Design a protein around this motif. Structure first.
Motif, PDB file in Angstrom:
ATOM      1  N   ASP F  43       1.119  -1.051  -0.024  1.00 25.81           N
ATOM      2  CA  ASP F  43       0.053  -0.241   0.050  1.00 25.81           C
ATOM      3  C   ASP F  43       0.802   1.287   0.044  1.00 25.81           C
ATOM      4  OD1 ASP F  43      -1.994   1.824   0.511  1.00 25.81           O
ATOM      5  OD2 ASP F  43      -2.697   0.804   2.270  1.00 25.81           O
ATOM      6  N   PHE F  44       1.070   1.870  -1.146  1.00 24.68           N
ATOM      7  CA  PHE F  44       2.008   3.017  -1.524  1.00 24.68           C
ATOM      8  C   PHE F  44       1.493   4.090  -1.861  1.00 24.68           C
ATOM      9  CE2 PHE F  44       5.722  -0.232  -3.174  1.00 24.68           C
ATOM     10  CZ  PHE F  44       5.909  -0.741  -1.840  1.00 24.68           C
ATOM     11  N   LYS F  45       1.489   5.413  -0.948  1.00 29.37           N
ATOM     12  CA  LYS F  45       0.649   6.668  -1.257  1.00 29.37           C
ATOM     13  C   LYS F  45       1.684   7.795  -0.971  1.00 29.37           C
ATOM     14  CE  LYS F  45      -2.135   5.926   2.138  1.00 29.37           C
ATOM     15  NZ  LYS F  45      -3.456   5.965   3.114  1.00 29.37           N
ATOM     16  N   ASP F  46       1.482   8.733  -2.063  1.00 25.01           N
ATOM     17  CA  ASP F  46       2.040  10.075  -1.382  1.00 25.01           C
ATOM     18  C   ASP F  46       3.552  10.174  -1.472  1.00 25.01           C
ATOM     19  OD1 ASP F  46       2.107  12.791  -0.838  1.00 25.01           O
ATOM     20  OD2 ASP F  46       1.243  12.791   1.178  1.00 25.01           O
ATOM     21  N   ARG F  47       4.029  10.279  -3.018  1.00 25.52           N
ATOM     22  CA  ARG F  47       5.533  10.466  -2.937  1.00 25.52           C
ATOM     23  C   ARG F  47       6.226   9.269  -2.230  1.00 25.52           C
ATOM     24  NH1 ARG F  47       6.476  17.132  -2.656  1.00 25.52           N
ATOM     25  NH2 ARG F  47       4.438  17.862  -3.055  1.00 25.52           N
ATOM     26  N   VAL F  48       6.154   8.151  -3.067  1.00 21.90           N
ATOM     27  CA  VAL F  48       6.634   6.831  -2.611  1.00 21.90           C
ATOM     28  C   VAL F  48       7.803   6.501  -3.822  1.00 21.90           C
ATOM     29  CG1 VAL F  48       6.757   4.373  -2.108  1.00 21.90           C
ATOM     30  CG2 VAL F  48       4.980   5.939  -1.100  1.00 21.90           C
ATOM     31  N   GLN F  49       8.970   6.090  -3.655  1.00 23.37           N
ATOM     32  CA  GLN F  49       9.885   5.550  -4.702  1.00 23.37           C
ATOM     33  C   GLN F  49      10.306   4.270  -3.891  1.00 23.37           C
ATOM     34  OE1 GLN F  49      14.099   6.769  -5.200  1.00 23.37           O
ATOM     35  NE2 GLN F  49      13.429   7.180  -7.454  1.00 23.37           N
ATOM     36  N   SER F  50       9.959   3.175  -4.622  1.00 23.16           N
ATOM     37  CA  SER F  50       9.928   1.747  -4.534  1.00 23.16           C
ATOM     38  C   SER F  50      10.935   1.315  -5.349  1.00 23.16           C
ATOM     39  CB  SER F  50       8.768   1.002  -4.037  1.00 23.16           C
ATOM     40  OG  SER F  50       9.006  -0.267  -3.768  1.00 23.16           O
ATOM     41  N   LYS F  51      12.154   0.620  -5.232  1.00 22.29           N
ATOM     42  CA  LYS F  51      13.181  -0.202  -5.859  1.00 22.29           C
ATOM     43  C   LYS F  51      13.012  -1.522  -5.349  1.00 22.29           C
ATOM     44  CE  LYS F  51      15.341   3.935  -7.293  1.00 22.29           C
ATOM     45  NZ  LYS F  51      16.773   4.608  -7.954  1.00 22.29           N
ATOM     46  N   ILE F  52      12.684  -2.756  -5.852  1.00 20.02           N
ATOM     47  CA  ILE F  52      12.996  -3.964  -5.709  1.00 20.02           C
ATOM     48  C   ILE F  52      13.605  -4.707  -6.971  1.00 20.02           C
ATOM     49  CG2 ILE F  52      11.615  -6.176  -5.151  1.00 20.02           C
ATOM     50  CD1 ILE F  52       9.209  -4.396  -4.418  1.00 20.02           C
ATOM     51  N   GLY F  53      15.118  -5.013  -6.496  1.00 15.97           N
ATOM     52  CA  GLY F  53      15.734  -5.702  -7.438  1.00 15.97           C
ATOM     53  C   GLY F  53      16.115  -5.078  -8.629  1.00 15.97           C
ATOM     54  N   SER F  54      16.051  -3.710  -8.777  1.00 23.36           N
ATOM     55  CA  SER F  54      16.423  -2.612  -9.914  1.00 23.36           C
ATOM     56  C   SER F  54      17.701  -2.431 -10.002  1.00 23.36           C
ATOM     57  CB  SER F  54      15.336  -1.726 -10.070  1.00 23.36           C
ATOM     58  OG  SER F  54      15.526  -0.620  -8.996  1.00 23.36           O
ATOM     59  N   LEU F  55      18.382  -2.093 -11.165  1.00 21.51           N
ATOM     60  CA  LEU F  55      19.713  -1.485 -11.249  1.00 21.51           C
ATOM     61  C   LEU F  55      19.389  -0.070 -12.010  1.00 21.51           C
ATOM     62  CD1 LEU F  55      21.950  -4.441 -12.184  1.00 21.51           C
ATOM     63  CD2 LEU F  55      21.257  -3.677 -10.006  1.00 21.51           C
ATOM     64  N   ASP F  56      19.885   0.692 -11.482  1.00 23.60           N
ATOM     65  CA  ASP F  56      19.736   2.022 -11.944  1.00 23.60           C
ATOM     66  C   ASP F  56      21.093   2.802 -11.871  1.00 23.60           C
ATOM     67  OD1 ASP F  56      16.736   3.348 -10.706  1.00 23.60           O
ATOM     68  OD2 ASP F  56      17.312   1.322 -10.485  1.00 23.60           O
ATOM     69  N   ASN F  57      21.517   3.505 -13.284  1.00 24.03           N
ATOM     70  CA  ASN F  57      22.531   4.460 -13.436  1.00 24.03           C
ATOM     71  C   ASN F  57      21.971   5.602 -13.853  1.00 24.03           C
ATOM     72  OD1 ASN F  57      24.798   2.214 -13.250  1.00 24.03           O
ATOM     73  ND2 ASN F  57      24.086   1.490 -15.036  1.00 24.03           N
ATOM     74  N   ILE F  58      22.066   6.685 -12.977  1.00 21.60           N
ATOM     75  CA  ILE F  58      21.662   7.952 -12.906  1.00 21.60           C
ATOM     76  C   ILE F  58      22.660   9.020 -13.100  1.00 21.60           C
ATOM     77  CG2 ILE F  58      19.778   9.421 -12.095  1.00 21.60           C
ATOM     78  CD1 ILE F  58      18.433   7.129 -11.054  1.00 21.60           C
ATOM     79  N   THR F  59      23.048   9.663 -14.039  1.00 22.86           N
ATOM     80  CA  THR F  59      23.821  10.748 -14.111  1.00 22.86           C
ATOM     81  C   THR F  59      23.388  12.252 -14.447  1.00 22.86           C
ATOM     82  OG1 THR F  59      25.446   9.444 -14.915  1.00 22.86           O
ATOM     83  CG2 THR F  59      25.819  11.564 -15.502  1.00 22.86           C
ATOM     84  N   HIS F  60      23.209  13.166 -13.564  1.00 24.91           N
ATOM     85  CA  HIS F  60      23.044  14.527 -13.616  1.00 24.91           C
ATOM     86  C   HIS F  60      24.198  15.296 -13.552  1.00 24.91           C
ATOM     87  CE1 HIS F  60      18.742  13.127 -12.417  1.00 24.91           C
ATOM     88  NE2 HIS F  60      18.378  14.301 -12.981  1.00 24.91           N
ATOM     89  N   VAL F  61      24.139  16.225 -15.052  1.00 28.37           N
ATOM     90  CA  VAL F  61      25.436  17.072 -15.137  1.00 28.37           C
ATOM     91  C   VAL F  61      24.783  18.416 -15.428  1.00 28.37           C
ATOM     92  CG1 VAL F  61      27.636  17.528 -16.314  1.00 28.37           C
ATOM     93  CG2 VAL F  61      26.889  15.188 -15.714  1.00 28.37           C
ATOM     94  N   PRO F  62      24.476  19.556 -14.426  1.00 27.12           N
ATOM     95  CA  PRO F  62      24.095  20.763 -14.479  1.00 27.12           C
ATOM     96  C   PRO F  62      25.398  21.555 -14.857  1.00 27.12           C
ATOM     97  CG  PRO F  62      23.001  19.654 -12.740  1.00 27.12           C
ATOM     98  CD  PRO F  62      24.126  19.037 -13.179  1.00 27.12           C
ATOM     99  N   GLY F  63      26.610  21.229 -14.326  1.00 26.89           N
ATOM    100  CA  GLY F  63      27.986  21.632 -14.563  1.00 26.89           C
ATOM    101  C   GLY F  63      28.690  21.466 -15.772  1.00 26.89           C
ATOM    102  N   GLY F  64      29.923  21.420 -15.768  1.00 30.65           N
ATOM    103  CA  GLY F  64      30.873  21.083 -16.761  1.00 30.65           C
ATOM    104  C   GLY F  64      30.913  22.180 -17.846  1.00 30.65           C
ATOM    105  N   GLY F  65      30.289  23.260 -17.713  1.00 25.93           N
ATOM    106  CA  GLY F  65      30.401  24.314 -18.594  1.00 25.93           C
ATOM    107  C   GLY F  65      31.681  25.015 -18.647  1.00 25.93           C
TER     108      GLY F  65
END
Lengths: 75, 75, 75, 76, 76, 76
Positions: F43-65
């Motif tokens: 029972d997941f409500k109101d801004r839940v992030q759930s990860k079960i056995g997932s693999l995530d590669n997440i890259t954020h680059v606001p810089g490097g200018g």
């Protein structure tokens, strides 16, 4: 005068008998084998052998080397 | 005068008997084998052997080498 | 005068008997084999053998090498 | 005489480069073995993102812009 | 005589480079063996992100911009 | 006589480089063996992030200018 008779005689045996020779296996019985496996993780190489009754013979050895040299020198 | 009679005689045997020779297996019985597997993960190489009754003979050895040198030198 | 008789005689045997020779297998019985698998993951090479009754003979060996040299030198 | 010679030969061989996002990567055999979801009901409402056994490659590049300004002035 | 010679020959071979985000990576056989979710109900409401056995590569590049300003002035 | 010679030959071979985010990495066989979640209800409500056995590669680059400013001025 000079007479040389060079008559060496070789009747030798070199023999290797290696491994499983002349055995009797009368009614050998391997039992019932059960392998129940769940929720296993292996990160590297697996070698698996499963069975009731094995006869395994391995022979890296039992090799023969014979070296023979005959030299006759006159003068 | 000089006489040389070079008459060496070789009747020798070099023999390898390697592995599983002359065995008797009378009514060998492998049992029932069960391999139940669920929810397994393997990250690398798997070698698997499953069975009730195995006769395995492996012979890397049992090789023969014979070397025989004859030299007669006169003057 | 000089007389040289060079009459070396070779009746020798070099033999390999490598592997599974002269065995008797009277009524060998492999049992029932069951391999039940579900929900398995393999990331690399798999080698699998399944069966009730195996006779396996492997012979990388059992090789023969014979070297013979005859030199007669006069003056 | 009192002569004047001006030679104005500035040279530009420069490079401005942006390499932004997902470049030159290797993804070799990606994916899980088995994924199972067992329920009597799945009830998803009001801004749900659900991923079950999916592979996603997502690249957003709001950036990586290049601005080059060059000015030349000769006044005699 | 009282002559003047000016030789204005500046040279630019410069590089301005941005390499931003996910570049030149190797992902070799990523993923879990088994993932299982058992329930009677999954009830997801109001901004839910659910990932079950998924693989995600996400790259956001708001940056990596290049700005080059060059000015040349000769006054005699 | 009283002549004047000016030679203006500055040379720029410079490099300005940004390398920002996930560069040149090796991810070799990542992932768990077994992941199991067993319930009667999720029972997941109101801004839940759930990860079960997932693999995530997440890259954020606001810089490097990169910003390069160059000015050249010769006044006689």
């Amino acid at each position: 005068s000079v007479q040389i008779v060079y008559k060496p005689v070789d009747l030798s045996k070199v023999t290797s008998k290696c491994g499983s020779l002349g055995n009797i296996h009368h009614k050998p019985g391997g039992g019932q084998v059960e392998v129940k496996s769940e929720k296993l993780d292996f990160k590297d190489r697996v070698q698996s052998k499963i069975g009731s009754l094995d006869n395994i013979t391995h022979v890296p050895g039992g090799g023969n080397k014979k070296i023979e040299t005959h030299k006759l020198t006159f003068r």
